[PDB]
Protein backbone atom coordinates (compact mmCIF):
# COMPACT_ATOMS: atom_id res chain seq x y z
CA UNK A 1 0.00 0.00 0.00
CA UNK A 2 1.38 3.38 -1.03
CA UNK A 3 -0.40 6.51 0.13
CA UNK A 4 0.15 9.17 -2.53
CA UNK A 5 -1.35 12.61 -2.94
CA UNK A 6 -1.18 15.27 -5.64
CA UNK A 7 -1.34 19.05 -5.41
CA UNK A 8 -2.68 20.53 -8.66
CA UNK A 9 -0.34 23.51 -8.54
CA UNK A 10 -1.61 25.09 -11.76
CA UNK A 11 -3.47 28.36 -11.30
CA UNK A 12 -5.46 27.95 -14.49
CA UNK A 13 -6.24 24.65 -16.12
CA UNK A 14 -2.95 23.05 -17.11
CA UNK A 15 -4.09 19.96 -19.01
CA UNK A 16 -6.34 19.40 -22.02
CA UNK A 17 -7.96 16.21 -23.34
CA UNK A 18 -8.34 16.52 -27.07
CA UNK A 19 -10.12 13.85 -29.09
CA UNK A 20 -8.10 12.38 -31.93
CA UNK A 21 -9.09 9.13 -33.64
CA UNK A 22 -12.34 7.17 -33.72
CA UNK A 23 -12.20 3.69 -35.24
CA UNK A 24 -15.08 1.51 -34.02
CA UNK A 25 -18.76 1.78 -33.18
CA UNK A 26 -19.78 -0.72 -30.53
CA UNK A 27 -23.46 0.08 -31.04
CA UNK A 28 -25.33 -1.17 -34.09
CA UNK A 29 -25.67 2.37 -35.55
CA UNK A 30 -29.11 1.31 -36.75
CA UNK A 31 -32.82 1.14 -35.94
CA UNK A 32 -34.50 -0.98 -33.27
CA UNK A 33 -36.82 -0.04 -30.38
CA UNK A 34 -36.46 -0.02 -26.62
CA UNK A 35 -38.19 -3.05 -25.09
CA UNK A 36 -40.65 -1.15 -22.91
CA UNK A 37 -42.41 -4.36 -21.88
CA UNK A 38 -39.10 -5.39 -20.33
CA UNK A 39 -38.63 -1.93 -18.79
CA UNK A 40 -41.91 -2.02 -16.89
CA UNK A 41 -42.60 -5.75 -16.50
CA UNK A 42 -45.55 -5.76 -14.09
CA UNK A 43 -48.11 -3.61 -15.92
CA UNK A 44 -50.91 -5.91 -17.06
CA UNK A 45 -54.13 -5.02 -18.85
CA UNK A 46 -56.86 -5.60 -16.28
CA UNK A 47 -58.95 -7.80 -18.55
CA UNK A 48 -57.17 -11.08 -19.14
CA UNK A 49 -57.98 -11.89 -22.77
CA UNK A 50 -57.00 -8.51 -24.22
CA UNK A 51 -53.70 -8.71 -22.31
CA UNK A 52 -52.88 -12.15 -23.72
CA UNK A 53 -53.81 -10.96 -27.22
CA UNK A 54 -51.63 -7.84 -26.92
CA UNK A 55 -48.64 -9.74 -25.51
CA UNK A 56 -48.99 -12.38 -28.22
CA UNK A 57 -49.36 -9.92 -31.10
CA UNK A 58 -46.47 -7.71 -29.98
CA UNK A 59 -44.05 -10.65 -29.94
CA UNK A 60 -43.29 -10.40 -26.22
CA UNK A 61 -43.17 -13.23 -23.70
CA UNK A 62 -45.20 -13.28 -20.47
CA UNK A 63 -43.52 -12.02 -17.27
CA UNK A 64 -43.58 -15.63 -15.85
CA UNK A 65 -45.32 -14.39 -12.62
CA UNK A 66 -42.28 -12.88 -10.94
CA UNK A 67 -42.73 -13.23 -7.19
CA UNK A 68 -42.74 -10.20 -4.93
CA UNK A 69 -39.20 -10.72 -3.62
CA UNK A 70 -37.92 -10.78 -7.21
CA UNK A 71 -40.17 -7.77 -7.84
CA UNK A 72 -38.51 -5.89 -4.98
CA UNK A 73 -35.14 -6.90 -6.44
CA UNK A 74 -36.23 -5.63 -9.86
CA UNK A 75 -37.08 -2.31 -8.26
CA UNK A 76 -33.67 -2.46 -6.56
CA UNK A 77 -32.06 -3.41 -9.88
CA UNK A 78 -31.80 -6.43 -12.17
CA UNK A 79 -30.97 -7.50 -15.70
CA UNK A 80 -34.00 -9.15 -17.31
CA UNK A 81 -33.47 -9.74 -21.03
CA UNK A 82 -30.88 -12.29 -22.10
CA UNK A 83 -28.44 -11.48 -24.87
CA UNK A 84 -29.40 -12.45 -28.40
CA UNK A 85 -28.44 -15.61 -30.27
CA UNK A 86 -25.96 -13.95 -32.63
CA UNK A 87 -24.92 -10.40 -33.54
CA UNK A 88 -22.57 -9.27 -36.29
CA UNK A 89 -23.72 -5.70 -35.66
CA UNK A 90 -23.26 -3.82 -32.42
CA UNK A 91 -25.26 -3.52 -29.24
CA UNK A 92 -28.87 -2.46 -29.68
CA UNK A 93 -29.97 0.91 -28.29
CA UNK A 94 -32.81 3.24 -29.36
CA UNK A 95 -35.90 4.94 -27.94
CA UNK A 96 -39.24 6.46 -28.90
CA UNK A 97 -41.18 9.64 -28.18
CA UNK A 98 -44.60 10.81 -29.35
CA UNK A 99 -44.54 13.75 -31.74
CA UNK A 100 -47.12 16.04 -33.21
CA UNK A 101 -47.14 15.44 -36.99
CA UNK A 102 -47.03 19.17 -37.83
CA UNK A 103 -44.02 20.22 -35.77
CA UNK A 104 -41.58 22.74 -37.25
CA UNK A 105 -39.25 20.11 -38.68
CA UNK A 106 -37.10 22.64 -40.56
CA UNK A 107 -35.97 24.23 -37.27
CA UNK A 108 -36.13 21.07 -35.17
CA UNK A 109 -34.53 18.28 -37.22
CA UNK A 110 -31.88 20.08 -39.29
CA UNK A 111 -29.94 21.67 -36.42
CA UNK A 112 -29.11 20.10 -33.02
CA UNK A 113 -32.10 20.81 -30.80
CA UNK A 114 -33.27 19.21 -27.58
CA UNK A 115 -35.97 16.58 -28.25
CA UNK A 116 -37.77 17.52 -25.03
CA UNK A 117 -39.34 20.45 -26.86
CA UNK A 118 -37.69 23.56 -25.44
CA UNK A 119 -34.14 24.86 -25.06
CA UNK A 120 -33.14 23.09 -21.84
CA UNK A 121 -29.62 24.52 -21.58
CA UNK A 122 -28.81 24.61 -17.87
CA UNK A 123 -25.88 26.98 -18.43
CA UNK A 124 -27.88 29.86 -19.91
CA UNK A 125 -29.65 30.72 -16.64
CA UNK A 126 -28.08 32.59 -13.74
CA UNK A 127 -26.34 30.38 -11.16
CA UNK A 128 -28.15 29.19 -8.02
CA UNK A 129 -31.49 30.20 -9.56
CA UNK A 130 -33.85 27.24 -9.32
CA UNK A 131 -36.98 29.35 -9.85
CA UNK A 132 -35.85 30.93 -13.13
CA UNK A 133 -34.48 27.60 -14.38
CA UNK A 134 -37.69 25.70 -13.63
CA UNK A 135 -39.63 28.53 -15.28
CA UNK A 136 -37.40 28.13 -18.34
CA UNK A 137 -38.04 24.38 -18.28
CA UNK A 138 -41.71 24.04 -17.29
CA UNK A 139 -43.55 27.30 -18.01
CA UNK A 140 -45.28 27.95 -21.33
CA UNK A 141 -46.02 31.66 -21.09
CA UNK A 142 -42.42 32.43 -22.06
CA UNK A 143 -40.62 31.19 -25.15
CA UNK A 144 -37.14 29.74 -25.15
CA UNK A 145 -34.52 31.64 -27.12
CA UNK A 146 -33.24 28.86 -29.40
CA UNK A 147 -36.60 28.43 -31.13
CA UNK A 148 -38.95 31.32 -30.51
CA UNK A 149 -42.07 29.25 -30.27
CA UNK A 150 -42.68 28.34 -26.64
CA UNK A 151 -43.14 24.66 -27.58
CA UNK A 152 -42.28 22.28 -30.40
CA UNK A 153 -43.89 19.17 -28.86
CA UNK A 154 -46.72 19.72 -26.34
CA UNK A 155 -46.83 15.98 -25.65
CA UNK A 156 -43.19 16.23 -24.56
CA UNK A 157 -42.31 19.65 -23.13
CA UNK A 158 -44.81 20.08 -20.30
CA UNK A 159 -44.51 18.89 -16.72
CA UNK A 160 -46.30 15.60 -16.24
CA UNK A 161 -46.60 14.83 -19.96
CA UNK A 162 -46.34 11.48 -21.74
CA UNK A 163 -42.57 11.52 -22.14
CA UNK A 164 -42.16 12.96 -18.65
CA UNK A 165 -43.91 10.01 -17.01
CA UNK A 166 -42.14 7.69 -19.46
CA UNK A 167 -38.66 9.23 -19.22
CA UNK A 168 -38.23 11.44 -16.16
CA UNK A 169 -36.62 9.10 -13.67
CA UNK A 170 -38.54 10.55 -10.72
CA UNK A 171 -41.80 9.70 -12.45
CA UNK A 172 -40.29 6.40 -13.56
CA UNK A 173 -39.59 5.34 -9.97
CA UNK A 174 -43.30 5.70 -9.16
CA UNK A 175 -44.13 3.18 -11.89
CA UNK A 176 -41.27 0.78 -11.20
CA UNK A 177 -38.70 -0.25 -13.76
CA UNK A 178 -35.50 -2.13 -14.45
CA UNK A 179 -32.92 0.35 -13.20
CA UNK A 180 -30.19 -1.72 -14.88
CA UNK A 181 -31.69 -0.78 -18.25
CA UNK A 182 -30.28 2.31 -19.92
CA UNK A 183 -32.61 4.85 -21.52
CA UNK A 184 -30.90 7.47 -23.73
CA UNK A 185 -33.88 9.85 -23.56
CA UNK A 186 -33.73 10.36 -19.77
CA UNK A 187 -30.64 12.60 -19.97
CA UNK A 188 -32.92 15.19 -21.60
CA UNK A 189 -35.65 14.69 -18.98
CA UNK A 190 -33.81 14.45 -15.62
CA UNK A 191 -34.98 17.86 -14.40
CA UNK A 192 -34.56 16.58 -10.83
CA UNK A 193 -30.86 17.39 -11.28
CA UNK A 194 -30.89 19.69 -14.33
CA UNK A 195 -32.16 22.20 -11.77
CA UNK A 196 -29.37 21.05 -9.44
CA UNK A 197 -26.65 21.56 -12.08
CA UNK A 198 -27.09 25.20 -13.19
CA UNK A 199 -23.93 26.30 -11.38
CA UNK A 200 -21.25 28.78 -12.40
CA UNK A 201 -19.26 28.04 -15.55
CA UNK A 202 -16.07 26.55 -14.11
CA UNK A 203 -18.14 24.73 -11.50
CA UNK A 204 -20.18 23.37 -14.42
CA UNK A 205 -16.94 22.26 -16.12
CA UNK A 206 -15.67 20.33 -13.10
CA UNK A 207 -19.19 18.99 -12.57
CA UNK A 208 -19.05 17.87 -16.21
CA UNK A 209 -15.74 16.06 -15.69
CA UNK A 210 -16.69 13.94 -12.67
CA UNK A 211 -20.09 12.24 -12.17
CA UNK A 212 -21.79 13.74 -15.26
CA UNK A 213 -20.76 10.79 -17.41
CA UNK A 214 -22.50 7.42 -17.67
CA UNK A 215 -21.48 3.79 -17.29
CA UNK A 216 -22.33 1.09 -19.83
CA UNK A 217 -21.74 -2.66 -19.62
CA UNK A 218 -20.02 -3.18 -22.95
CA UNK A 219 -19.96 -6.97 -23.13
CA UNK A 220 -23.70 -7.67 -23.05
CA UNK A 221 -25.70 -7.41 -26.29
CA UNK A 222 -28.19 -5.02 -24.73
CA UNK A 223 -27.19 -1.81 -23.00
CA UNK A 224 -26.92 -1.93 -19.21
CA UNK A 225 -26.10 0.68 -16.59
CA UNK A 226 -22.81 -0.55 -15.16
CA UNK A 227 -21.14 -0.11 -11.78
CA UNK A 228 -17.92 1.81 -11.23
CA UNK A 229 -14.80 -0.34 -11.30
CA UNK A 230 -16.09 -2.94 -13.73
CA UNK A 231 -16.08 -0.27 -16.46
CA UNK A 232 -14.91 3.34 -16.58
CA UNK A 233 -17.32 6.18 -17.14
CA UNK A 234 -18.12 7.21 -20.71
CA UNK A 235 -17.61 10.84 -21.70
CA UNK A 236 -20.68 12.52 -23.18
CA UNK A 237 -20.88 16.03 -24.69
CA UNK A 238 -24.68 15.86 -25.03
CA UNK A 239 -24.99 16.18 -21.26
CA UNK A 240 -23.30 19.58 -21.48
CA UNK A 241 -25.12 21.30 -24.34
CA UNK A 242 -28.41 19.42 -23.63
CA UNK A 243 -28.70 18.86 -27.38
CA UNK A 244 -28.74 15.87 -29.72
CA UNK A 245 -27.43 15.56 -33.16
CA UNK A 246 -29.56 15.14 -36.31
CA UNK A 247 -28.57 11.95 -38.09
CA UNK A 248 -29.69 11.80 -41.73
CA UNK A 249 -33.17 10.42 -42.31
CA UNK A 250 -35.02 9.77 -45.55
CA UNK A 251 -38.71 8.93 -45.73
CA UNK A 252 -38.35 7.36 -49.20
CA UNK A 253 -35.61 5.18 -50.71
CA UNK A 254 -35.31 7.52 -53.71
CA UNK A 255 -33.73 10.14 -51.46
CA UNK A 256 -31.39 7.58 -49.86
CA UNK A 257 -30.47 6.48 -53.39
CA UNK A 258 -29.65 9.97 -54.65
CA UNK A 259 -27.69 10.59 -51.45
CA UNK A 260 -25.71 7.38 -52.00
CA UNK A 261 -25.04 7.99 -55.70
CA UNK A 262 -23.58 11.51 -55.65
CA UNK A 263 -21.28 11.37 -52.64
CA UNK A 264 -18.27 13.67 -52.12
CA UNK A 265 -19.64 15.57 -49.14
CA UNK A 266 -23.29 15.51 -50.25
CA UNK A 267 -24.66 14.61 -46.83
CA UNK A 268 -25.01 17.81 -44.77
CA UNK A 269 -27.64 19.35 -47.06
CA UNK A 270 -31.36 19.01 -46.36
CA UNK A 271 -33.31 18.19 -49.54
CA UNK A 272 -37.10 18.39 -49.37
CA UNK A 273 -39.62 16.91 -51.82
CA UNK A 274 -43.43 17.22 -51.53
CA UNK A 275 -43.93 14.70 -48.75
CA UNK A 276 -40.40 13.33 -48.57
CA UNK A 277 -37.33 14.91 -47.04
CA UNK A 278 -33.79 14.27 -45.89
CA UNK A 279 -32.10 16.08 -43.03
CA UNK A 280 -28.41 16.87 -43.23
CA UNK A 281 -25.96 14.72 -41.31
CA UNK A 282 -24.27 17.53 -39.44
CA UNK A 283 -20.85 15.94 -38.80
CA UNK A 284 -19.91 13.63 -41.71
CA UNK A 285 -19.38 10.49 -39.63
CA UNK A 286 -21.28 8.36 -42.13
CA UNK A 287 -19.34 9.84 -45.07
CA UNK A 288 -15.65 9.22 -44.27
CA UNK A 289 -15.56 7.16 -41.07
CA UNK A 290 -15.03 3.72 -42.59
CA UNK A 291 -13.30 4.72 -45.84
CA UNK A 292 -10.49 6.81 -44.31
CA UNK A 293 -8.08 4.04 -43.14
CA UNK B 1 -59.09 -26.07 0.62
CA UNK B 2 -58.27 -29.72 -0.07
CA UNK B 3 -56.19 -28.78 -3.12
CA UNK B 4 -53.96 -26.33 -1.25
CA UNK B 5 -52.27 -28.88 1.02
CA UNK B 6 -51.82 -31.68 -1.51
CA UNK B 7 -48.71 -32.82 -3.40
CA UNK B 8 -48.97 -33.13 -7.16
CA UNK B 9 -46.95 -34.44 -10.06
CA UNK B 10 -46.55 -30.82 -11.16
CA UNK B 11 -47.17 -27.74 -9.04
CA UNK B 12 -47.62 -25.08 -11.71
CA UNK B 13 -50.47 -26.48 -13.80
CA UNK B 14 -52.19 -27.76 -10.65
CA UNK B 15 -51.99 -24.24 -9.23
CA UNK B 16 -53.29 -22.83 -12.54
CA UNK B 17 -56.32 -25.15 -12.64
CA UNK B 18 -57.00 -24.49 -8.95
CA UNK B 19 -56.78 -20.76 -9.71
CA UNK B 20 -59.45 -21.21 -12.38
CA UNK B 21 -61.54 -23.22 -9.89
CA UNK B 22 -61.54 -20.80 -6.96
CA UNK B 23 -62.92 -17.23 -6.95
CA UNK B 24 -65.96 -18.57 -8.78
CA UNK B 25 -68.93 -16.18 -8.61
CA UNK B 26 -72.20 -16.75 -10.45
CA UNK B 27 -74.15 -14.00 -12.17
CA UNK B 28 -77.77 -13.24 -11.34
CA UNK B 29 -79.14 -14.13 -14.78
CA UNK B 30 -79.26 -17.89 -15.29
CA UNK B 31 -77.79 -17.96 -18.80
CA UNK B 32 -74.09 -17.70 -17.89
CA UNK B 33 -74.07 -20.01 -14.88
CA UNK B 34 -73.63 -23.00 -17.20
CA UNK B 35 -70.28 -22.05 -18.74
CA UNK B 36 -68.85 -20.98 -15.38
CA UNK B 37 -69.94 -24.21 -13.70
CA UNK B 38 -68.51 -26.06 -16.71
CA UNK B 39 -65.09 -24.44 -16.37
CA UNK B 40 -65.25 -25.22 -12.64
CA UNK B 41 -66.05 -28.84 -13.50
CA UNK B 42 -63.21 -29.17 -16.01
CA UNK B 43 -60.75 -27.69 -13.49
CA UNK B 44 -62.00 -30.07 -10.79
CA UNK B 45 -61.77 -33.08 -13.10
CA UNK B 46 -58.21 -32.09 -14.10
CA UNK B 47 -57.29 -31.98 -10.39
CA UNK B 48 -59.03 -35.34 -9.98
CA UNK B 49 -57.27 -37.13 -12.85
CA UNK B 50 -53.86 -35.71 -11.96
CA UNK B 51 -54.23 -36.28 -8.21
CA UNK B 52 -54.96 -40.00 -8.70
CA UNK B 53 -51.72 -40.17 -10.79
CA UNK B 54 -52.99 -41.19 -14.20
CA UNK B 55 -52.69 -39.52 -17.57
CA UNK B 56 -55.04 -37.00 -19.15
CA UNK B 57 -55.28 -36.35 -22.87
CA UNK B 58 -52.97 -33.40 -23.51
CA UNK B 59 -54.06 -32.96 -27.13
CA UNK B 60 -54.70 -29.29 -27.86
CA UNK B 61 -58.29 -28.58 -28.84
CA UNK B 62 -60.10 -31.48 -27.17
CA UNK B 63 -61.28 -30.95 -23.60
CA UNK B 64 -61.29 -33.72 -21.03
CA UNK B 65 -64.66 -35.40 -20.43
CA UNK B 66 -66.64 -34.61 -17.29
CA UNK B 67 -66.82 -38.02 -15.64
CA UNK B 68 -66.53 -39.57 -12.20
CA UNK B 69 -63.06 -40.69 -11.13
CA UNK B 70 -62.54 -44.27 -9.87
CA UNK B 71 -66.08 -45.20 -8.84
CA UNK B 72 -67.87 -48.44 -8.13
CA UNK B 73 -70.36 -48.96 -10.93
CA UNK B 74 -73.52 -49.43 -8.84
CA UNK B 75 -73.27 -45.80 -7.73
CA UNK B 76 -72.58 -44.91 -11.37
CA UNK B 77 -75.79 -46.55 -12.60
CA UNK B 78 -77.53 -44.89 -9.64
CA UNK B 79 -76.22 -41.59 -11.03
CA UNK B 80 -77.41 -42.52 -14.55
CA UNK B 81 -80.93 -43.41 -13.38
CA UNK B 82 -81.18 -40.28 -11.20
CA UNK B 83 -79.90 -37.98 -13.93
CA UNK B 84 -82.19 -39.57 -16.53
CA UNK B 85 -85.16 -39.25 -14.18
CA UNK B 86 -84.43 -35.56 -13.80
CA UNK B 87 -84.07 -35.41 -17.60
Amino acid sequence: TQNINTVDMGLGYTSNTCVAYVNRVRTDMGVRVQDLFRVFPMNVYRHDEVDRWIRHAAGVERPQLLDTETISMLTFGSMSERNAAATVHGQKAACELILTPVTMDVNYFKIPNNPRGRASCMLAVDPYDTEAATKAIYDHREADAQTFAATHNPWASQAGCLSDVLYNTRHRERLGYNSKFYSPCAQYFNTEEIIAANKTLFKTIDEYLLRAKDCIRGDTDTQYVCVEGTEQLIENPCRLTQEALPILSTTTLALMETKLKGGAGAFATSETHFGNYVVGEIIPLQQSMLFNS
Amino acid sequence: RRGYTYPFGDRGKARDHLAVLDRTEFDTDVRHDAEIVERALVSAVILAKMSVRETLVTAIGQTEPIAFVHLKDTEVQRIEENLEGVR
Binding site: G10, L11, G12, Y13, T200, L201, F202, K203 | -
Partner: protein, 49 residues
Protein backbone atom coordinates in the same frame (compact mmCIF):
# COMPACT_ATOMS: atom_id res chain seq x y z
CA UNK C 1 -11.95 29.45 6.87
CA UNK C 2 -8.20 29.98 7.13
CA UNK C 3 -6.03 32.73 8.61
CA UNK C 4 -5.81 35.11 5.68
CA UNK C 5 -3.78 37.43 7.91
CA UNK C 6 -1.17 34.67 7.87
CA UNK C 7 -1.32 34.82 4.08
CA UNK C 8 -0.86 38.59 4.18
CA UNK C 9 1.84 39.15 6.80
CA UNK C 10 4.14 36.19 6.12
CA UNK C 11 6.68 36.39 3.29
CA UNK C 12 5.75 34.80 -0.03
CA UNK C 13 7.42 33.58 -3.21
CA UNK C 14 7.38 36.02 -6.12
CA UNK C 15 5.88 34.17 -9.08
CA UNK C 16 5.05 35.43 -12.59
CA UNK C 17 1.45 34.33 -12.17
CA UNK C 18 -0.75 34.05 -15.24
CA UNK C 19 -3.86 32.10 -16.09
CA UNK C 20 -6.20 32.01 -19.04
CA UNK C 21 -9.14 34.14 -17.90
CA UNK C 22 -9.45 37.45 -16.12
CA UNK C 23 -8.76 37.43 -12.39
CA UNK C 24 -12.16 38.75 -11.27
CA UNK C 25 -13.94 36.44 -13.73
CA UNK C 26 -12.12 33.47 -12.20
CA UNK C 27 -13.00 34.85 -8.77
CA UNK C 28 -16.73 35.51 -9.22
CA UNK C 29 -17.34 32.14 -10.87
CA UNK C 30 -15.32 30.19 -8.24
CA UNK C 31 -12.68 28.44 -10.32
CA UNK C 32 -11.01 27.39 -7.05
CA UNK C 33 -12.28 25.76 -3.87
CA UNK C 34 -12.38 28.57 -1.29
CA UNK C 35 -11.77 32.25 -1.97
CA UNK C 36 -11.60 35.53 -0.08
CA UNK C 37 -12.02 38.91 -1.78
CA UNK C 38 -11.43 41.93 0.40
CA UNK C 39 -12.05 44.96 -1.76
CA UNK C 40 -10.67 48.03 -0.03
CA UNK C 41 -7.97 47.92 2.65
CA UNK C 42 -8.80 45.68 5.55
CA UNK C 43 -7.21 46.39 8.95
CA UNK C 44 -7.77 42.79 10.05
CA UNK C 45 -4.23 41.65 9.20
CA UNK C 46 -2.83 44.07 11.80
CA UNK C 47 -4.56 42.18 14.63
CA UNK C 48 -2.85 39.10 16.06
CA UNK C 49 -4.33 36.86 18.74
Amino acid sequence: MENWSALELLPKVGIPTDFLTHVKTSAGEEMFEALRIYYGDDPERYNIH
